[PDB]
Every structure is written in structure tokens, then in C-alpha cells.
């Protein structure tokens, strides 16, 4: 197996799963890891479990010699800046950016300018596309087994925003707000069920519940924690997103339904392990409902026990990178681009501006 | 047993329906229907099973002495032109007219006038409230065992409209649009469970499936057959509707989900029996799940067998009319009255009126 050599730049809570899926994949070796908060760095390299250079700056990361592809965990609004050192670098590296790839419509803007010159692989990392029953209803609805779709609901049921390092996840502008920051990956999987274009977006969400009294530095967290999305899709196709953020009760997390004119499937998918009940493992589900003949069929999806293990996105970030290890390997292409990152996030943008202004927006 | 002896003005589909759970409650006798398609008359005749005045005027009902209380079944458009008659009539008797109570703008605002004089019980027969497994979730919502409720979700995966007669139910201007003809139900839920009332309406919608090749004198179907549908309330609660008329494959026909902010709770309703897999009896489930300690709790709530055999609304229909008895017999409230009516068919017309202008529209 050829050893990639990989830079992590932002060692929090999504490196750490980044590092425990590279473990399960032959060749792949962290080399360097780069972050200003000295604790991260300890508590990633204990990951790890095995010697790697660190870095209090990127910049010295990318000047190090030590790496052949990039892993960008950092706060959302970091992204970009961190994107730009890397077009200039001249290290030509392939990097693999978390979601949202960026926060705000100019910093969109300007990304969009810079990536078009860039020519080594950019993976922007919603990965949630490749949880083993999120394939399965996407592979359903892109073979026809549907018919033709014209609906599309999905409902985030789950826990308040965990504790970030300096709070970054408690700010609108740190983060784009909700729904980009959580809900990039959902609007993204409108796109890819669809195969269709967004051109309306209507939402209604508020600040009602989570980290009401939270200061931090002198600021006030102004996340929405819950909210109702409708958009309206190129070719007369519409899609729902219900999120609630303290909704952590519910044994299933997210539900997934496709309607169309033949048939309805929907899936179940249960909150990680790590957050929930010690003791009852749930499987996810996928259920078929077609039109006629009336005769629903429901299985589980099992993720292997590994895979499942190494993450809290049910297996998800585990094919992720055997895709981004086939794109620097030259091998594969780029699954998830910028353009995706970008569109998503412009979705999202457009869905906190409904909230704010109480109308749609175009597309 | 204290005899009422009710008179049908329209003698069809739902009328049959009102027979049947009438046969289950004593004291009940039909001397009088009235409809002006005889196949009606006779096809109600024979579900009641005994002998019947019938009329092809509702006038000539009214002045018939015959009747204590009255039902409308008649077509939306006609319910208002009844009611006047009945208001001008002098005979002072109950009605219990079905929903929705009118159909359009102009509709509502006389029938506003004049119900306000009108000193016999008016009750509008939307009787989604009393199917056990809602009236579960509506005790729970209002006895406080989720907390404060921030968010309410009704999705209903249905068949296509049924035939009518004259095709009534086929036309916009006949019914007053889907989102009144089929959803007043669900946005009267929406004010009662949430306790609060609509501030704005957004809904996305088409006609893009059914009833394609039906065609009536040259002319198609013009009813919305998918939306989607989003309401803010005075207080800060938001609640979403979900309807596809194309999804008739799904076991369970109905979901409501409540959120508060210390639980969730859900019910899922199949499919009527005579409409599902003739075999597959699907009981009703609520399930509970509070957001501390974690533990989700599930149930079947049982319909009585023949309160359940007598109708397509889980048993609803049958506890209507011990209401409506009781308001006949000046011993208890109308529950569910005009004013209840107006609101759920002006939060229909205007989601009708968003999906077209595509804009959220004020209430
Ligand atoms: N794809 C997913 O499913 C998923 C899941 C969780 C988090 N995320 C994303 O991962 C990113 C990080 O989130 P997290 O949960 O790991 O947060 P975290 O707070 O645990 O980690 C962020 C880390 O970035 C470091 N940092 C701050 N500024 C930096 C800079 N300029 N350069 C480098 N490092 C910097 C911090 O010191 C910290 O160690 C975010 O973009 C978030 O949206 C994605
Ligand atoms: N609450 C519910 O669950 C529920 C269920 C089904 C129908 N409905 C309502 O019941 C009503 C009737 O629908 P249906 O399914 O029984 O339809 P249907 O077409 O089966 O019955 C309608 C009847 O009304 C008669 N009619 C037509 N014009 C009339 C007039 N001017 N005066 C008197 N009778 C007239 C027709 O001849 C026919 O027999 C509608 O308002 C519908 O919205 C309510
Ligand atoms: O739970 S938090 O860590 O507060 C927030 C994160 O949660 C999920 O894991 C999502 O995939 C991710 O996109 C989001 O950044
Ligand atoms: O199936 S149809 O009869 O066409 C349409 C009817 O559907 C259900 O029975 C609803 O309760 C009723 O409101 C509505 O009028």
C-alpha cells in the first residue's frame, strides 16, 4: 500500500475522528499537525498514538516538507484563510476542507475566483452522502425505483451544540449560522437526491431554547436552535428540513424521505452510540413503500463495527477518505467539490436570511 | 334514551359515514335526507337500513317538522348557501355542518356576520382531535408533560382524492383549493394543540401527479396533490405540514410530532382498513421520548373495533357525534365551532394564495 502522508491543520473533535478513520485505511500516515491551542495538540497526538511534528501555524505545516495531502478541521471561519495560504503555497497539496467550506457570500465569492486557478484535488468533507442506509435511498432514487421524485424531507432530531474550543459553534459569526454550519450537509443532499438546483428558499427558525444566558469574552450566543426549511428546486421538486436541537430524545436522529409518483422510501438512523443509552444498540433502517401494489418492505443497514466505531456519523467519514485517498492518488475523482461547498452554503445563507426577514429568497 | 332524530342535507360518501357511527350511539334516529342526485338518496337509504323520508330540497327538510338536529355533507361550496337557509329557516335547529365550513375569502367573512346571530349549536365537523392516539398527544402537549412546545409537525402520506359526485372534489373553486378541501384538519390541530394563533403562511405546492387523464367536459383537475407548509404563531411556536396524495404505499397515513423543550412526543396512524392490505390489521402508536434521562416509550392505542369499523378517521367520527348529542341536548359546549372553522379555512386559502405567488403571506 502506498503511504500517503497527511497534514492535519485544526486538531479539535473532527480531527480526532479524522485520525481514528485513517487507522482503518492501509497506507495513510499523519506526519503533521497544526493548531494554536496547545491542548488540542496533546489530546490529538494521544490519538494518534504514535510520534507526529506539530505546529502552532499552519503556515509552518505547509512549509514543512512532511506531507502529501491536507486535512482542514478548523473553526468554519478559518477555512477560507487557510484555503488562500494553500493556493499561494506553490506545495500544490490536495486537501480535503471540513464543511461549511466557508461562512459568509463574500467570502463565497471569492473562494469560488481562487479554486477555479487551484488544480490539486479540494474535497469539501459533507460526507454524509456515504452512511451505508443514506446510499441506499440515494441509489433508490437515482435508479428510478421511485419514479420520477418530487419530494424530499429531512428531520434532524438531536442535542444542543457540544462545547468547542473558545466557543466558535455558539457565534453566527463564526459559524454562517445554523444552517450552515449544521445544515450545509442537508441542503447538499437535496442536490445530490434531486439532481436539481435550488431557486427559492423559505425558512422560519428561532433562538428559543439552548444557551440562552451563555456569555463568552463578552458576547452572546445567537444560535438558532430549531427550524423549518421548504425549497423549491428548477424542475418543480421541493425539499423540507425540520431541525430541532433539543429534540435529544428521540431514539432515531435523522429521518429521510423520498416521494415520488411510484413510491416512497425512508430511512431511520439512529443516534451515535456515544451519545446515547449504554446498552441498546438501534440499527438504521431503510423502508420501501411502493405505490401499488401496497406492500411496504423494511431492513436494516448495518455499518461494519469498525467503521461504525471510529466515528459519531454512522460510518460516513470512513468512506470519505478511502474516496479522497483514490483523488490524491490520481486514481478517483473529487466526490464532493468546491462548487458543492459552495452551493450549500449558499443555501444556508439564504435560509438564515429568511429567518431574519420573514421571506423567501431567491436563488 | 332520549330520541334526536337528525336530518342529512347531502346524502353521500361522508354522509354514509355519519350513519354508521350514529347506528352506535342509542337515541339515535335519521328521518330525513335530503340531496338532489337520487342514486344518493338511495345508496344512503340503504346504509341506514330502515325507513327514511327523503328530500331532493333541503328546504323542503327544513319546513319537513321531522328533524331535532341537522348534518351537511354537501359539497364545500355549498355549505355556506345552506347554513343562510337554515339561519332564515326559524327553526332554531343544531347543525353540525362538515368541514371545511366554507371556501373562500368572501365565503367567510358573511358567514362571520352571520353565525354571530345565530343562537343553536353550530359545530364544524372536523373531528381529527378525537382519534384516541391525537387525543393522547393533545392531553399530553396541554397537561405540560413536554414542557413549553416550540415546534409541531403533521405529514400525511395519502392516496389520491376519491371520486365524488358531479367530480366536486376535482376543482379549486369547489372546494376552496387542497390546502382547504384536505388541510383546514391540520391547521385547526396546529391552533389547538399549540394553543396559539398563525401570525404568517408560507406553502410550496403543485399539481404534478394525479388525475392526469381524468378528464370532465374537456376539463383536467386544477387541485394541488404535494406541499409543504410552514406557519408561524403570535407566541413563537412554528409548525409544518407535509402532504403528498401520492404516497399511498406508507403503512401509517398520519405522523404528528410535538417538540417541547422537555420532550417529544409522536403518533404514528395507519392507513383505514379498508383502504390498506386486506390481512395487516396496523395498530396506532405514541410514542414518548423526554429529553432526560433518555428512554423512549412506545405504545399502541387501541380503537374500539366497531367505532373503528364505522369509519376512515380512526374512530374520530363516533366521538364527534357524543359531542355533537350532548349540544343537542343543552348539556355540553360546542367544541369545535365556526370560529375554529373560519381560521383553519383562512390558513388554507392563504397557503393556497402562497403557492401561488410564491411569497409567505400574513394572517
Ligand atoms: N463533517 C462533519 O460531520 C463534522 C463534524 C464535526 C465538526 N465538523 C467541522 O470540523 C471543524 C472543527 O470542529 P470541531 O468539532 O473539531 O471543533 P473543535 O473546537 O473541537 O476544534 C477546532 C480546533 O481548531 C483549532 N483552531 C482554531 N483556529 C485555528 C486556526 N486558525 N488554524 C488551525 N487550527 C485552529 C482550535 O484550537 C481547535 O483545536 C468545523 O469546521 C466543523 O464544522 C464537521
Ligand atoms: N370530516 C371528514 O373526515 C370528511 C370526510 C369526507 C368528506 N368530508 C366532507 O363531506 C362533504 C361531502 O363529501 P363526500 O365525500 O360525502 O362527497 P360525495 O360527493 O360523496 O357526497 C356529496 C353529496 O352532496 C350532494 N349535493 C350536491 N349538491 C348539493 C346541494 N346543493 N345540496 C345538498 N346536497 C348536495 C351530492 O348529490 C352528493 O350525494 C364535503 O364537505 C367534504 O369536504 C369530510
Ligand atoms: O454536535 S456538534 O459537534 O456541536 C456540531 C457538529 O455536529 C454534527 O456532528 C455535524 O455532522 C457537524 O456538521 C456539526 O459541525
Ligand atoms: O379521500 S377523499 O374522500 O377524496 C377526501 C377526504 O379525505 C379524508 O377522508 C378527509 O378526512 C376529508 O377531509 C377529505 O374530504
Redesign the pocket.
Given at each position: 500500500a502506498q503511504t500517503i502522508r497527511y497534514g492535519l491543520?485544526?486538531?479539535?473533535?473532527?480531527?480526532?475522528?479524522h485520525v481514528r478513520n485513517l487507522a482503518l485505511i492501509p497506507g495513510s500516515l499523519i506526519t503533521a499537525v497544526?493548531?494554536?491551542?496547545p491542548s488540542?495538540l496533546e489530546e490529538?497526538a494521544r490519538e494518534i498514538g504514535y510520534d507526529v511534528q506539530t505546529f502552532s501555524?499552519?503556515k509552518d505545516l505547509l512549509a514543512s516538507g512532511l506531507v502529501d495531502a491536507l486535512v482542514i478541521?478548523?473553526?468554519?471561519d478559518?477555512?477560507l484563510?487557510?484555503l488562500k495560504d494553500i493556493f499561494a503555497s506553490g506545495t500544490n497539496l490536495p486537501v480535503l476542507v471540513?464543511?461549511?467550506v466557508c461562512t459568509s457570500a463574500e467570502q463565497a465569492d471569492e473562494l469560488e475566483e481562487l479554486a477555479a486557478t487551484y488544480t490539486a484535488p479540494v474535497w469539501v468533507?459533507?460526507?454524509?452522502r456515504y452512511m451505508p442506509p443514506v446510499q441506499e435511498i440515494i441509489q433508490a432514487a437515482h435508479s428510478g425505483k421511485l419514479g420520477n421524485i418530487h419530494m424530499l424531507s429531512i428531520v434532524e432530531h438531536r442535542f444542543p451544540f457540544?462545547h468547542?474550543?473558545?466557543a466558535?459553534?455558539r457565534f453566527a459569526e463564526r459559524?454562517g449560522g445554523t444552517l450552515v454550519?449544521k445544515c450545509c450537509?442537508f441542503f447538499d443532499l437535496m442536490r445530490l437526491i434531486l439532481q436539481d438546483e435550488p431557486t427559492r428558499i423559505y425558512a422560519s427558525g428561532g433562538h428559543d431554547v439552548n444557551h440562552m444566558d451563555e456569555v463568552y469574552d463578552g458576547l452572546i450566543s445567537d444560535m438558532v436552535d430549531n427550524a423549518y426549511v421548504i425549497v423549491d428546486f428548477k424542475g418543480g421538486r421541493r425539499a423540507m428540513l425540520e431541525l430541532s436541537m433539543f429534540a435529544e430524545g428521540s431514539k432515531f436522529q435523522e429521518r429521510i424521505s423520498i416521494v415520488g409518483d411510484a413510491a416512497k422510501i425512508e430511512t431511520l438512523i439512529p443516534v451515535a452510540a456515544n451519545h446515547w443509552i449504554e446498552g441498546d444498540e438501534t440499527e438504521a433502517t431503510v423502508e420501501f413503500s411502493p405505490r401499488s401494489p401496497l406492500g411496504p418492505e423494511k431492513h436494516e443497514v448495518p455499518v461494519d463495527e469498525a467503521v461504525l466505531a471510529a466515528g459519531?456519523?454512522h460510518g460516513?467519514?470512513y468512506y470519505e477518505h478511502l474516496g479522497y485517498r483514490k483523488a490524491i492518488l490520481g486514481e478517483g475523482p473529487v466526490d464532493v467539490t468546491v462548487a458543492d461547498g459552495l452551493q450549500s452554503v449558499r443555501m444556508g445563507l439564504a435560509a438564515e436570511q429568511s429567518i431574519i426577514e420573514g421571506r423567501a429568497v431567491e436563488l
Open positions: 491543520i485544526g486538531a479539535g473533535h473532527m480531527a480526532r475522528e497544526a493548531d494554536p491551542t488540542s490529538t501555524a499552519h478541521a478548523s473553526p468554519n478559518t477555512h484563510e487557510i471540513e464543511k461549511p468533507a459533507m460526507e454524509y457540544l468547542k474550543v473558545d466558535w459553534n459559524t454550519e450537509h459519531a456519523h460516513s467519514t
